[PDB]
Amino acid sequence: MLKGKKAVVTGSTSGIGLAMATELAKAGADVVINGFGQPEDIERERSTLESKFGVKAYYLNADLSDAQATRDFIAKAAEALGGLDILVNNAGIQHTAPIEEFPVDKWNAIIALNLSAVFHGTAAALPIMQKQGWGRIINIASAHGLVASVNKSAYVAAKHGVVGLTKVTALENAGKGITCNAICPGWVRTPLVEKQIEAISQQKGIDIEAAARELLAEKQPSLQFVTPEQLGGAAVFLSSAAADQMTGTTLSLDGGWTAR
Amino acid sequence: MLKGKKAVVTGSTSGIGLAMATELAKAGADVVINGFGQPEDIERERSTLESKFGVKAYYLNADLSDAQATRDFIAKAAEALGGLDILVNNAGIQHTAPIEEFPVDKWNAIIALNLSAVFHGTAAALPIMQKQGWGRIINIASAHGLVASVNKSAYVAAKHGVVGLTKVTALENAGKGITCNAICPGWVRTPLVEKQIEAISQQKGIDIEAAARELLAEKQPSLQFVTPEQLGGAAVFLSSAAADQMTGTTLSLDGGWTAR
Amino acid sequence: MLKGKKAVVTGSTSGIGLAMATELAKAGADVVINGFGQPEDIERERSTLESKFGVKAYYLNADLSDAQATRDFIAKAAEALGGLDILVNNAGIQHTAPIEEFPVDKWNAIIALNLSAVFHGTAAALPIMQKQGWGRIINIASAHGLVASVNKSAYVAAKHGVVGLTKVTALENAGKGITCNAICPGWVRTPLVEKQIEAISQQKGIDIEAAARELLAEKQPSLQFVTPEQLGGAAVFLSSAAADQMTGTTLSLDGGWTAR
Amino acid sequence: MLKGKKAVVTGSTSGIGLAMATELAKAGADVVINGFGQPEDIERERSTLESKFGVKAYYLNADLSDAQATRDFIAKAAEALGGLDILVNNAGIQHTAPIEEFPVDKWNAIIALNLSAVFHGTAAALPIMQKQGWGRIINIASAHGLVASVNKSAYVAAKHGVVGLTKVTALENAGKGITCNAICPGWVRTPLVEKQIEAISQQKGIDIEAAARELLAEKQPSLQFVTPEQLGGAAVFLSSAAADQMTGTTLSLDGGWTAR
Ligand SMILES: NC(=O)c1ccc[n+]([C@@H]2O[C@H](COP(=O)([O-])OP(=O)(O)OC[C@H]3O[C@@H](n4cnc5c(N)ncnc54)[C@H](O)[C@@H]3O)[C@@H](O)[C@H]2O)c1
Ligand SMILES: NC(=O)c1ccc[n+]([C@@H]2O[C@H](COP(=O)([O-])OP(=O)(O)OC[C@H]3O[C@@H](n4cnc5c(N)ncnc54)[C@H](O)[C@@H]3O)[C@@H](O)[C@H]2O)c1
Ligand SMILES: NC(=O)c1ccc[n+]([C@@H]2O[C@H](COP(=O)([O-])OP(=O)(O)OC[C@H]3O[C@@H](n4cnc5c(N)ncnc54)[C@H](O)[C@@H]3O)[C@@H](O)[C@H]2O)c1
Ligand SMILES: NC(=O)c1ccc[n+]([C@@H]2O[C@H](COP(=O)([O-])OP(=O)(O)OC[C@H]3O[C@@H](n4cnc5c(N)ncnc54)[C@H](O)[C@@H]3O)[C@@H](O)[C@H]2O)c1
Ligand code: NA
Ligand code: NA
């Protein structure tokens, strides 16, 4: 556990990121959360981290598709926490279309958030971690950082990029007490995936749960979703001493996706 | 933690395997240990698992280079434990030489133990795990299951084989409550590596600790050994609920080896 | 050979790209070249393709860091050639620095050219190839699309991205007569690498050829550079019938870099 | 082309190997063929290589599941040819079953032929190639050297092993003028695959060509078989000067299998 640690999770107002923040707070870390949503919902989440788990929590709104806003977000997060031990670069978006129809603005948006924000956030965090001789950078990539699917050019490119960037970060900081790894989930039933399930259901003329089964069966041999709580557990493991020499690698929780 | 669980670790009389057994016993599992060594040392280890950690422990001697002996070992282990929830296929040997000089008997020995024993042990364990709808198979591969080094033809071939076999096991048992993953360590300073350090030291005419540094610097960017305790921690993570959808993959704890 | 084929090579005014164009022209393709340099040198190269190899050649200046300029370049190339059978996405730049010092504008420039231009060029080319039921898209990635090195965050991220994008392109166009693959070279002694050799030489206080040897020895087991002509040969192979079912993959010509 | 070169192809009495031998003979190499079959068919193939392509051809019967027989085969091949420039390690077998039912003798047979014979053949060939400062070792692995499928434990393990062994061979001989690479095909409609198609057809109660379509659709995005002639073309490319710095890698011709 992580008592005393200071953690930042991007895109933690909902989905995987919120489960990350929750597991980190449970383990005893103070947490900065981030992302979009209804103000009342976000404040309920912030206050819940504090009242359930007895840690400090802060919400810092920053649109991480902007480089300077990301760099400023990290600075503000570190100021709030009084340090920065663990950075989870999680915020991301999706858009599906074939390449020749793929909107240029969607390409740019996905590269900006899913790839460039990881770079800018890392760049801002590293000097803090380097000065204290301890850090964890945990990038949320995807099975799509290792393999491809149709109609996901920007996302697959970005996630592959994140895997590469994770490696560079690790190598540059090897031996310094700082590790960087990429968690690579398969399907997790958040709203990012519910939209894809809904789209299949309309294409096929089937109920939503039949469509969820079809989505799993195509990619994920276990035929079960990965959960946000499982991913939170993986982040806590990466943050532990057992993972001191785990750096520059991918941790796939994907129900067998990448085994075939 | 793993209270009530029944674990078998091959090649757990010393080295990584003994640390695996220790962490599993600490987490509350009963443990079957296995491997060669001085009878008094092995019995001290068995009795220590019991008296420190309050679990049952059994030592079953089996030379796992023999298929039938491996299959019989699993049966005897399951009988002793009253079940079999977690199998860690760890036993292995090494021999370095270039291919054209590599002894045929050493090729055969390394394939037999480092690869075939994983198959035979898995084959024996699976029906037990399938009937109870829960299992963990944890194969100890290597960074050398993903990349190569000179003079390690048999070992690299075997370890790559283990990574492949891990994938097949995972896919065949997808959704059944059984996962199979391969831990892929970089250098860990056991006697298997001390022999290689000694060999460098003689080649270079340097003290042993200088030779250990040279061994690390060539391969392992962190310039630190991975520890057996870290690997034990990884095994405990793989055995946890957070890893229910982690299957068919590799968990590299290698100080950056495979990032470059 | 490629008589009658219509090829476009980005960044073919010098370096690898010019060797690509040359091999394609030798094989009988008409070629559009592209890139920066002295006008007289570029025109000499264009006219040389024609007079040596008896093909048509065109130079179209476009700064491919701009999306619309890339898309317009493809349209103009296809108009010049009367079609578009083979697209080699080669143009790229490099900049070395550690992450926390890595200029934001250099990150943006490298992502724009080395990754985004591949997307925009592919997007523009695909409908042409889809309508004729034959095409080759050949992306020039790197060993750094598969593994990392220090101080190359943007480039490694971009090149990993290219490998991902190559996979998506291949899958979206599977069976259509169009393949997409990524050539992943190790060191090739162009000006992009000569700058790095010069930088080592100054850091170490050694002559340039000693520095070239040091650059090779660190990464490239063969201790020899890959040549632009070899890479041109690989492109010609990818464009051949033997490669009709080679799609979505990487072709490493790297002197062993990625084997270890 | 390969005029004057001396090539050996294991398991070249039929299937992929015979197409390998044919392309090598077409390119001007003398060829030793090997494998089982009807004596009259094998002699017709040998004599055809000579009369169509004007090269010398030899058939040497050796059961390559035996180490010493493999090593002796290489010696006899080199004696027949007057040298040995190109070795294609192709012979292989398949057997499908789940792990817990997988015959021990089939595990042993597949490891012996598909993995160990590659080692023994390489070991025998290397000193010949080392003394002349030129060689090509071309191992026929599979998509199953990179990823898994159910019911193929031994084969996947073996093929992964071959990929590892290829890397070691390459690294040990880096810079010596000898390269070693693994061709990794997807489905090729030989008798090894026809048996699997027939098995699907009986399971599903469908005609053989429907079953062939189902076999492709599951794994191979292009929905077309790879041909033996394509693979022969890849071998000829690997043997060319363009591939002098291609070593230690995999060349996937798999219709997109490994892209997803
Ligand atoms: N759901 C899956 O199956 C899955 C699988 C693998 C990887 N991923 C990755 O996990 C991460 C989280 O995905 P999720 O499924 O929880 O998605 P989600 O849509 O449920 O949550 C996205 C989060 O990011 C925030 N966000 C969006 N745009 C932002 C911006 N410009 N700046 C700051 N925050 C922003 C949202 O407000 C939200 O908090 C993403 O990187 C995604 O690619 C998801
Ligand atoms: N040490 C490292 O750096 C390292 C790194 C990666 C992977 N590995 C792998 O970890 C595993 C353990 O290695 P280690 O370094 O602890 O080695 P070790 O030599 O210290 O221990 C080997 C264990 O296996 C047992 N053993 C040997 N032959 C056996 C046989 N025929 N049957 C049953 N048991 C047998 C030994 O008695 C001992 O208990 C091996 O598979 C090895 O390949 C080790
Ligand atoms: N040299 C190597 O060792 C090596 C190895 C692997 C991959 N690569 C890749 O090969 C490709 C070519 O590299 P190179 O070594 O020949 O480099 P180079 O610097 O010699 O040539 C780069 C080419 O791209 C052009 N170019 C640059 N910016 C451009 C822009 N904005 N728009 C259009 N054209 C532009 C240049 O004018 C030139 O024609 C790059 O993608 C590089 O990443 C090179
Ligand atoms: N067919 C495919 O889809 C496919 C795909 C990828 C890889 N492969 C690999 O390609 C290689 C050739 O396969 P194929 O499909 O042509 O099979 P095949 O069954 O058509 O041919 C096998 C060849 O090996 C010979 N052989 C068998 N046992 C032997 C032994 N003990 N000693 C010497 N020779 C022996 C046979 O006589 C025959 O010449 C194998 O390694 C296989 O794993 C095949
Ligand atoms: Na590597
Ligand atoms: Na895959």
Q: Give, in order, the Cα–Cα distances in Å from B17 to each of B35, B185, C117, C136, C217.
A: 9, 13, 50, 51, 36
Q: How far apart are CA B29 and CA B83, in angstroms?
A: 12
Residue C185, SS3?
A: strand
Tokens of D166: 């290829």
Distance CA D256, CA A150 (A): 11
CA dist B87 to B9, B73, B235, Å? 6, 12, 10
Residue type, A64: L
Nearest Cα neighbor of A192 from A111, A103, A97, A96 is A96
How would you list the strands of the sheet with C250-253, edge to edge? C57-59, C30-33, C6-9, C86-89, C135-140, C178-185, C250-253
What's the one-letter identity of residue A216?
Answer: L
Instruction: List the beta bridge partners of residue D97.
Output: D152
What is the dihedral sign for C-alpha C90, C93, C96, C98?
negative
Distance CA A151, CA A141 (A): 17
Place of tokens 């090539």: D7
The CA–CA distances, whole Å, from A138 to A71, A181, C160, D161 equal 17, 5, 18, 32
Query: Which technique?
Result: X-ray
Q: Cite the DSSP H helix spans in chain D.
A: 15-26, 39-53, 67-81, 104-110, 117-132, 153-172, 191-204, 208-219, 228-238
Angle, vertex CA B103, rays to CA B101 and CA B104, nearest 5: 125
- The Cα–Cα gap between D43 and D77 comes to 17
Query: Residue A251 is which amino acid?
Result: L
How far apart (Å, rounded) are the C-alpha atoms in residues D113 and A17? Answer: 49
How far, in Å, CA of D168 to CA of C3, rounded? Answer: 40
State how far Cα B214 lies from the chain centre: 25
Query: D43-50 — which CB contacts under 8 Å span 24+ positions?
Result: D45/D13, D45/D18, D45/D21, D49/D21, D49/D22, D49/D25
For residue C34, the number of C-alpha atoms closer than 13 Å in the C-beta half-sphere is: 29
Please say whether the beta carbons of D57 and D80 come within 8 A: no
Residue D163 and residue D146 in contact, taking contact as beta carbons nearer than 8 Å: yes
Query: Would the CB atoms of D259 and C167 count as touching at under 8 Å?
Result: yes
Instruction: At D101, list the tokens.
Output: 């039912």
Residue nearest to atom 19 of ligand 4 (CA): D192
Burial class (CB in 10 A: 0-12, 13-18, 19+), C52: exposed
How many A from CA of A174 to the centre of ligand 5?
16
> What is d(CA C19, CA C31) in angstroms, rounded to the nearest whole number?
12
- Rounded CA-CA distance A201/A208 in Å is 6
**Cα(C178)–Cα(C155) distance, integer angstroms:** 27
- Beta carbons within 8 Å of D44's beta carbon, 6+ residues apart: none
Annotated binding site of A for Ca(2+): 260
Tell me if residue D235 falls in helix, strand or coil. Answer: helix
CA distances from D17 to B122, C210, D10, D45, D117 (A): 33, 44, 7, 12, 15
CA distances B93 to B28, B115, D165, D260, Å, are: 29, 11, 17, 35
Is residue D71 within 8 A of residue B102, CB to CB? The reply is: no
Token pair, residue A232, equals 């939170």
> Token pair 């909902």 is at which residue?
A14
Q: In the 8-state DSSP scheme, what is residue B143?
A: G
Nearest to D8 by CA among D138, D123, D109: D138
DSSP 3-state of A21:
helix
Tokens of D201: 């057809």
Q: Is A27 helix (H, G, I), strand (E, B) or coil?
A: coil
Q: Which residues contact D210 (CB under 8 A, 6 or more apart)?
A: D201, D204
Q: Compute how many other C-beta atoms are within 10 angstroms of the C-beta atom of residue C223.
A: 12
Residue that has been written with the tokens 């089939």 in this structure: D106
- Quick count: other Cβ atoms within 10 Å of Cβ C217? 10
Q: Cα(D191)–Cα(D173) distance, rounded to whole angstroms? A: 35
Burial of B226 (0-12, 13-18, 19+ CB in 10 A): buried
Which tokens go with A108?
Answer: 């740019």
Residue B151 sits at the chain C interface (C-beta within 8 Å): no
Q: State phi, psi for A25 to the nearest 5 degrees.
A: -65, -40
For ligand 6, a single-atom ion, the residues with CB < 5 A are A 147; D 147
- Rounded CA-CA distance D24/D3 in Å is 9
- Answer whether C214's CB lies under 8 Å from C206's CB: yes
C-beta atoms of A255 and B241 within 8 A: no
Let me know: does B106 contact B97? Beta carbons within 8 Å: yes
DSSP for C38-72?
A: -HHHHHHHHHHHHHHH---EEE----TTSHHHHHH
Entry resolution (Å): 1.2
Contacts of C88 (CB under 8 A, 6+ apart): C7, C8, C9, C10, C12, C17, C20, C24, C138, C139, C140, C235
What's the one-letter identity of residue B122? Answer: T
Q: How far apart are CA D128 and CA A181, in angstroms?
A: 45
Closest CA to D100 of B83, B126, B73: B126
**Pocket flag, ligand 2, residue B37 (CB < 6 Å):** yes
SS (H, E, C) C130-152: HHHCCEEEEEECCHHHCCCCCCE
CA B177, chain centre distance (Å): 22
The C-alpha angle A211, A215, A218, rounded to 5 degrees, equals: 130
Is residue B11 within 6 Å of ligand 2 at its C-beta? yes
Residues B81, C217: Cα–Cα separation, whole Å: 53
Dist CA B73 CA B76 (whole Å): 5
Secondary element (H or E) of residue D251: strand D250-253
The two three-digit tokens of residue A58, written as one number: 């802060």
Q: Is the Cβ–Cβ distance between C248 and C166 less than 8 Å? A: yes
Interface probe with D: pick from B160, B166, B249, B250, most Cβ of D within 10 Å: B160
Report the run of H or E that residue A139 belongs to, with start and end.
strand A135-140
Task: Inspect the interface and report whether the beta carbons of A252 and B255 lie closer than 8 Å.
Answer: no
The kind and range of the H/E element at C204 are helix C191-204
CA distances from D64 to D8, D13, D82, D185 (A): 13, 14, 21, 21
Could you tell me the CA-to-CA distances from D47 to A174, D31, D228 in Å, in that order?
A: 61, 11, 20
List chain A gaps (C–N > 2.5 A) by preceding residue: none
DSSP string, B98-130: -GGG--HHHHHHHIIIIIIHHHHHHHHHHHHHH
User: What is the distance between the alpha carbons of residues D35 and D33, in angstroms, rounded to a whole number?
Assistant: 7
Alpha helices per DSSP H over chain A: 15-26, 39-53, 67-81, 104-110, 117-132, 153-172, 191-204, 208-219, 228-238
Q: What is the CA radius of gyration of chain C?
A: 18
The Cα D179–Cα D85 span in angstroms is 11
Helix or strand run (H / E) with residue C212: helix C208-219
The type of residue at C62 is: A
Reported residue count of chain D is: 260
Structure letter (DSSP) for residue B82: T
Query: What stretches of chain B show up as alpha helix (H) in DSSP?
Result: 15-26, 39-53, 67-81, 104-110, 117-132, 153-172, 191-204, 208-219, 228-238
β A57-59/D178-185 pair status: unpaired
Q: Is the dihedral of CA B16, B19, B23, B28 positive or negative?
A: positive
Give the residue among B146, B93, B137, B110 at the shortest CA–CA distance from B252.
B146
Single out the residue of A197, A220, A217 nearest to residue A207, CA to CA: A197
Closest ligand 1 atom number to CA of residue A65: 31
Instruction: Return the number of other C-beta atoms located less than 10 Å from residue C71's C-beta.
Output: 19
End-to-end CA separation in angstroms for chain B: 34
Q: Are D92 and D115 in contact (CB under 8 A)?
A: no
β-bridge pairing A30-33 and A250-253: unpaired
d(CA D30, CA D2): 9
Q: Is A155 a catalytic residue?
A: yes
Distance between CA atoms of C22 and C16, rounded to whole angstroms?
A: 10
Which residue is listed with tokens 């034990």?
A: B232
Residues 83-112, chain D, touching B (beta carbon < 8 A): 98-100, 102, 104, 107-108, 111
Domains of chain B: 1-260 (3.40.50.720)
Q: DSSP assignment, residue D226? A: B
Rounded to a whole number of angstroms, the distance from the CA of A60 to the nearest CA of chain B is 28
The chain B residue lying nearest A163, using CA atoms, is B259
Rounded Cα distance between A216 and C206, Å, is 57
**Which residues in chain B have their CB less than 8 angstroms from residue D158's CB?**
161
Dist. CA B7–CA B20, nearest whole Å: 10
Structural tokens at position A38: 């209804």
Distance (Å, whole) CA C203 – CA C95: 17
From the CA atom positions of chain D, what is the Rg in Å? Answer: 18
8 A C-beta contact, residue C180 and residue C86: no
Q: Is C259 exposed, middle or buried (0-12, 13-18, 19+ CB in 10 A)?
A: buried
Q: Which helix (H) or strand (E) holds A3?
A: none
CA-to-CA separations, A11 to A73, D15, D257, in angstroms, rounded = 12, 54, 34
State the Cα–Cα distance between residues B87 and B125, nearest whole angstrom.
8
Closest approach of A121 to chain C, Cα-based (Å): 10
Pairing of strands D6-9, C250-253: unpaired
- Write the DSSP symbol of residue A151: T
| DSSP code of residue B136 | E
Interface with chain B: mutation pick from D68, D149, D168, D173, highest number of B CBs within 10 Å: D168
D47-56's contacts with Cβ under 8 Å and 24+ in sequence apart are D49/D21, D49/D22, D49/D25, D52/D25, D53/D22, D53/D25, D53/D26, D53/D28, D55/D25, D55/D28, D55/D29, D55/D30, D55/D31, D56/D30, D56/D31, D56/D81
Q: How many Cβ atoms from other residues are within 10 Å of residue B105's Cβ?
A: 10
